[PDB]
DNA sequence: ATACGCGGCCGCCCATCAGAATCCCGGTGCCGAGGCCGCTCAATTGGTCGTAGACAGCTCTAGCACCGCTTAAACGCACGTACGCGCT
């Protein structure tokens, strides 16, 4: 019973834009948002996200720093736990 | 002149001696392992040298994997035409 939405390199822009525009709402019930490596750190940003859980290093240095950079940003106020 | 006798002929069952035919034992020709063998020239034996190629080190291509944006190609189904194939 966890409401979420995926984000990888398969869905077009018309769908991932609706997903990201739906996640940025302050009353969104999607507390889990899945991403990827290149698609996760592809671009844009998440302001309401703060917790970044990584399963394993994606065989690239600083790829984790740039991956958390999509959530850990300036607009975040309640700190960032990784 | 008138009546009796018979004579070989013959069907009959009944007897003797040779020939035909099946079984009990056979020789003959064909095929395929054997043996013999012997002059001998190709393999084996004992031996040296050297070189291919195994092997370990190394680096440095390219085969794999993996991902996602883009889209041509595959898919499945609907409809009918023009062939497969059956008959004569």
Curated annotation (Swiss-Prot):
Please give the first and last residues shown and the length of the full protein: 735 to 816 of 1468
Effects seen without this gene: Decreased sensitivity to the cytotoxic effects of 6-azauracil.
Please report the name of this protein according to its UniProt entry: Chromo domain-containing protein 1
Known function? ATP-dependent chromatin-remodeling factor which functions as substrate recognition component of the transcription regulatory histone acetylation (HAT) complexes SAGA and SLIK. It recognizes H3K4me. SAGA is involved in RNA polymerase II-dependent transcriptional regulation of approximately 10% of yeast genes. At the promoters, SAGA is required for recruitment of the basal transcription machinery.
Report further notes.
Answer: Present with 1620 molecules/cell in log phase SD medium.
Q: What are the subcellular locations of this protein?
A: Nucleus
Upper lineage is: Eukaryota, Fungi, Dikarya, Ascomycota, Saccharomycotina
Task: Quote the gene name from the UniProt entry.
Answer: CHD1
Protein source organism = Saccharomyces cerevisiae (strain ATCC 204508 / S288c)
State the domain notes. The 2 chromodomains are involved in the binding to the histone H3 methyllysine at position 4 (H3K4me3). The CHD1 helical C-terminal domain (CHCT) binds DNA and nucleosomes.
Q: How does it assemble?
A: Component of the 1.8 MDa SAGA complex, which consists of at least of TRA1, CHD1, SPT7, TAF5, ADA3, SGF73, SPT20/ADA5, SPT8, TAF12, TAF6, HFI1/ADA1, UBP8, GCN5, ADA2, SPT3, SGF29, TAF10, TAF9, SGF11 and SUS1. TAF5, TAF6, TAF9, TAF19, TAF12 and ADA1 seem to be present in 2 copies. SAGA is built of 5 distinct domains with specialized functions. Domain I (containing TRA1) probably represents the activator interaction surface.
Q: Which family does it belong to?
A: Belongs to the SNF2/RAD54 helicase family.
